[PDB]
Amino acid sequence: STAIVTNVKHFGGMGSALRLSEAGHTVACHDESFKQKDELEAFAETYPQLKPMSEQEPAELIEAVTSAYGQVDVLVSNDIFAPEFQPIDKYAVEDYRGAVEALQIRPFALVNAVASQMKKRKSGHIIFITSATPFGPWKELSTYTSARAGACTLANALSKELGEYNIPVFAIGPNYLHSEDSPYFYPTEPWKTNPEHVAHVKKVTALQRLGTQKELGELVAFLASGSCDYLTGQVFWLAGGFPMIERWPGMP
Amino acid sequence: STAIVTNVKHFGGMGSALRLSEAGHTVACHDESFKQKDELEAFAETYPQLKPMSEQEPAELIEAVTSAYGQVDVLVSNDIFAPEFQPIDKYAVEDYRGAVEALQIRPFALVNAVASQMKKRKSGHIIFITSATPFGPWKELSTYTSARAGACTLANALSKELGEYNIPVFAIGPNYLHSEDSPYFYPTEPWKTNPEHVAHVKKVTALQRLGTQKELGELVAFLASGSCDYLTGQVFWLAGGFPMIERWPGMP
Amino acid sequence: STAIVTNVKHFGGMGSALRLSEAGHTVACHDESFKQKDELEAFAETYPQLKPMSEQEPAELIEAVTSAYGQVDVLVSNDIFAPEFQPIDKYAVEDYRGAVEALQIRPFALVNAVASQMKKRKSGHIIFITSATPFGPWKELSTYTSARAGACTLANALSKELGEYNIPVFAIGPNYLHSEDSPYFYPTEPWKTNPEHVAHVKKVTALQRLGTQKELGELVAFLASGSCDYLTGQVFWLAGGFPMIERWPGMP
Amino acid sequence: STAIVTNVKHFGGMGSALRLSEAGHTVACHDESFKQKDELEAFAETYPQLKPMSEQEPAELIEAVTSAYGQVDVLVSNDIFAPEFQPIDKYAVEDYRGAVEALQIRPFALVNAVASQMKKRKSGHIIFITSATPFGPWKELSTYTSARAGACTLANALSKELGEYNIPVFAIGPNYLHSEDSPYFYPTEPWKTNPEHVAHVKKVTALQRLGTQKELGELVAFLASGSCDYLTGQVFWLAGGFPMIERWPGMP
Ligand SMILES: O=[N+]([O-])c1ccc([C@H]2CO2)cc1
Ligand SMILES: O=[N+]([O-])c1ccc([C@H]2CO2)cc1
Ligand SMILES: O=[N+]([O-])c1ccc([C@H]2CO2)cc1
Ligand SMILES: O=[N+]([O-])c1ccc([C@H]2CO2)cc1
Numbered sequence A, B, C, D: 001s002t003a004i005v006t007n008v009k010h011f012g013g014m015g016s017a018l019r020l021s022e023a024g025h026t027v028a029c030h031d032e033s034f035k036q037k038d039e040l041e042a043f044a045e046t047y048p049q050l051k052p053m054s055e056q057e058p059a060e061l062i063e064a065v066t067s068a069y070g071q072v073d074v075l076v077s078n079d080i081f082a083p084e085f086q087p088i089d090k091y092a093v094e095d096y097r098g099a100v101e102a103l104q105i106r107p108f109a110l111v112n113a114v115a116s117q118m119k120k121r122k123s124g125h126i127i128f129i130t131s132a133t134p135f136g137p138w139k140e141l142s143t144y145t146s147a148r149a150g151a152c153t154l155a156n157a158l159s160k161e162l163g164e165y166n167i168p169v170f171a172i173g174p175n176y177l178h179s180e181d182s183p184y185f186y187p188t189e190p191w192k193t194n195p196e197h198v199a200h201v202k203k204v205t206a207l208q209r210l211g212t213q214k215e216l217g218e219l220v221a222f223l224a225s226g227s228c229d230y231l232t233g234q235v236f237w238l239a240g241g242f243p244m245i246e247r248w249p250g251m252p
Helices: A013-022 A037-046 A058-069 A093-121 A142-165 A195-204 A213-224 B013-022 B037-046 B058-069 B093-121 B142-165 B195-204 B213-224 C013-022 C037-046 C058-069 C093-121 C142-165 C195-204 C213-224 D013-022 D037-046 D058-069 D093-121 D142-165 D195-204 D213-224
Strands: A002-005 A026-029 A050-052 A074-078 A125-129 A169-174 A178-180 A235-238 B002-005 B026-029 B050-052 B074-078 B125-129 B169-174 B178-180 B235-238 C002-005 C026-029 C050-052 C074-078 C125-129 C169-174 C178-180 C235-238 D002-005 D026-029 D050-052 D074-078 D125-129 D169-174 D178-180 D235-238
Touching (some): A002 A013, A013 A026, A013 A050, A013 A213, A037 A050, A093 A125, A093 B142, A125 A213, A142 A169, B074 B093, B142 B169, B142 B235, C013 C026, C013 C050, C013 C213, C074 C093, C093 C125, C093 C142, C142 C235, C142 D142, C169 C213, D013 D050, D013 D213, D050 D058, D169 D213
Parallel strands (some): A125 A169, C026 C050, C125 C169, D125 D169
């Protein structure tokens, strides 16, 4: 079928896009960098199995893909944002608006623009790539964490109404997902190179390692394949056992 | 001590302000209608125990209450919004921006404006009156429901950093809370007078009745009293046992 | 690899065993009826791809499968119990001891018996088929519901310690899962043939239908395949969007 | 009114019993130590404001109190158990049965024996003192943690059916609750005396301290007073912000 993966160069983009691609799907890709013709061309040449789009806005992206490839069967909203950690009184209100805009309004807008075609055909799959931070908040990251929670609930609430149209909706909230070269949010440097960060991941995850793009890709492909639509409304915590909780003194 | 209750004329406003006042707090009250001198003076006359303020924005409100009453010991962010039930494709992206601005940005702005003084003296209480809809979402109310979820997580996230400063943070998510003359969100009419609505309430809640302003106010006063600060980060589902789930055929 | 599926003739048993077998696993099957040679040989004849075992207790079952097939790579604890709906005062304390023995003690006993070999080689997968009732409890089923919750948490708790040994642990909590000829818990008759039951399902689930054995089996195979071990600790609500919550009067 | 607090000498017993007592309630108390006449007498003399009972079994305790003081209005099931931390393969199955018996079956039995009188009068309050471990499991404590989860869900499930009889049911799951001289579960030594344990509590809780018996007492008295029955079904995490999640390297 035809799928859309946003911010393909970051977060769970390449894992999602490529696995969906390997599955035989036509994968249209979005990314801020695709604004530049040079960037989009370099990407189109490196990945002939993918279809990079120049469109940046939600409804515009949806239309470009629909016209270009017939329709949109699967939506993978790979949302990102660059938040600063900071005491609540140190943030500017605009810092919260920014997080909400990028992490809640964006996925809402994408679904708002594609739900019509999916509901008429009574077929489609919606997947939000959110975050596992809501499951275990770190102090001083209130903007990002609460915005991600809003997106998680958005997905669950959507499943309630789209199910009547045979449209499953899921939310995958990862953490410690190896992002390789992308700074969103666990790049090879220093997460796989620095002893201190490696020790950190070892301590906070049950599997004692970072998650892989392959794992995220496998889940997205599985959910989009229609093999288990009965899981609709599910929020998947892709965080390898995180959070591991500090045990009493005397325990290893 | 001094407490601030926003949108006092609606939702959990009156219950919170009245009970807080009885507990001994000087209660500064905010409401959109207070922009008008005639509305503020009328309220002030009906409720001499309350202290209605005219300030409308978060920053100026906290400053105003601080000048008049020395400081802000308790913040009750009684947030409201007038949403409509709509299939996701029938909403305008603007309708979600509106819900988030009213239900997430606003309480964030209030805490952002008052956190400094509370942290400086290491004392204070923050209470968000959110919603129980995230616990059990209805079809076609994705905007309001997801935004309320963002606020709930915001409260829990904030509890993690403010606890270091001895400042507890809580979220009270009601549903089926009798709002008397306020349209937000269960006015006496029709919820207590129309056969179909009355029956609906007896069906969807375990206690088979609407929640009262007194119960909400009792909880607010209890949490702000300092009697149980160890509950910090808690999201209280004030919905009388809602949601009651449809049982198998034949069961009474 | 080798997988074990318990109570194979009921609940999520057939879906799990059949799909696991298709994936390439040698599937050892347990069932209470296998105590009888006539029942075991009949099953073995109908499903030549499956390997029915006669062993009934956890310890002997794992030992038996280990001798015959070398080792146990995947454990699917498909636990069942025959509860009755009863007001708490109408239950006998014995009825709860029974539910807990069947829904908590049993899976605990299986993991307790197989964990050693999995940890020694640092590989394996553990899947508990629990229930989604804890997500949305019905009145008068406190025994079964609370016991299933104990099992779900058992799975999540186990994921924390076994992750160190590269052993993922998951819980699949279904509801409205078509059990075909099995009375546990949604047999084709009446759930797919009686007007009232059929209508009930369309009302309480988002997808408005029963879950299929194939969907459950797809999930089991996917989790045991090693494609997404990073989901360890996850409780999957396999209930098609259940529970759907009663909306206000007048709404279609 | 008349209340029953079990295992009064341990966990949240003294905080509950005494505060309920200070409120003017007739508080009948149970404790294993009360088996010995000497023990019960020493307690009766030290606390004339409390009514220690010799009965040990659920139904027996309920009858003794009912006959002695007319009826049972409030039930505070202060359940305890002494679990060992241990890899799942190192536990004996009996270790899980023991935890379940003490943490699930006991509270179930108490409610099973008192629900009748409360439902006929259509008045009463049920409070389970469980644990916050299910909210954030430590590795190698699978028996205790999962049993507590079962009790938490038991309370929520019970609220669904008892609400029709105006009977609120709550679960209070504490952690890091100062137990003073009781070994269940955070005695003064070494939790308040040892620098290492003090540093631990400081790190894992948001309020950076142990919870107090007064705080637990205040919540139990509040819930039993009937001031906020609309919170029925609520599970209260009385753990002071726990769990605090390890932040990235470089963060304070
Ligand atoms: O900004 N951060 O520090 C941050 C940290 C972790 C994540 C996880 C969800 O992917 C996102 C963002
Ligand atoms: O707009 N509605 O339909 C609505 C319904 C219920 C609530 C609950 C949170 O108080 C708010 C709004
Ligand atoms: O006994 N019942 O009524 C019952 C109902 C629903 C389920 C769900 C978990 O598969 C099990 C049992
Ligand atoms: O046995 N332990 O190690 C233990 C630890 C913590 C608690 C918390 C719930 O009160 C109970 C038991």
